[PDB]
Amino acid sequence: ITSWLYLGGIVRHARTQNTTKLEEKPEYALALLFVPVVCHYCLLHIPSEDLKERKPHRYLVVIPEIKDFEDASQRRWRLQQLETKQFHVSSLGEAGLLYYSLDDIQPEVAYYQACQVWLYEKTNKASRQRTLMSIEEIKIDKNILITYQQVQKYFKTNYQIIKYKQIFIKVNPIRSLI
DNA sequence: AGATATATCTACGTTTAACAGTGGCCTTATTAAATGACTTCTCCATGATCTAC
């Protein structure tokens, strides 16, 4: 297999391309074919960089831990409802929490969800393709999620600045900090 | 020479009382930065193809 099928599975040593290549059974290869549907994609904005002077290009890939097929399907279909301006975030944890923002909260059921955030970013200005720059695990319990909803409620949302074909999005740093 | 009991005068009174600031103010103006910069390069992954043994 190759990196397009399994993210991060590049051949380290190109001169040994034929031998040192990741190998998998056909069914797992089909799963690696169908991975892209589940994972959502978010855009990351550097707070230090003025968004006017730098359009977002970093891509965060949120890959959720699977506990049940139906639960994951319902979660993904629920997250389909959100607006694109929400997807523009200022931190990896913000995107992870957004992936679990629309999950139902049950007080009898001990809620616990885990997901992976994969950061893809051009190494330099003239980079031809993005490179995996960060992977971070997020484990969200009940208290963290309700606190995040409380922060979302009290703290203001993103300002959808719109200019000449320039729909900038103003993310509140505090929300991310919290 | 050693051991021992004695004698040495003032002194006294040494402040009593009542108070221990009364008044008014305890900053008035104005300015709460002015500019410009918010990385700079390269280091790509993978497969088709060329070529030497």
Protein residues contacting strand B, judged by Cβ under 7 Å: A 2-4, 9-11, 14, 17, 48-50, 53, 123-129, 131
| Residue A120 to residue A61: CA distance in whole angstroms | 8
- Output the furthest CA–CA distance in chain A (Å, rounded): 56
Measured in angstroms, what separates residue A77's CA from nucleotide B8's C1'? 124
Dihedral pair phi/psi, residue A166, rounded to 5°: -135, 80
Pairing relation of β-strands A40-44 and A88-89? parallel
Distance A11 CA to B42 C1' (A): 20
Nearest to A119 by CA among A29, A14, A8, A10: A8
**Strand B, nucleotides covered by protein (CB < 7 Å):** 38-47
Q: Is A52 exposed, middle or buried (0-12, 13-18, 19+ CB in 10 A)?
A: exposed
Q: What is the dihedral of CA A100, A106, A108, A109, to 10 degrees?
A: -30
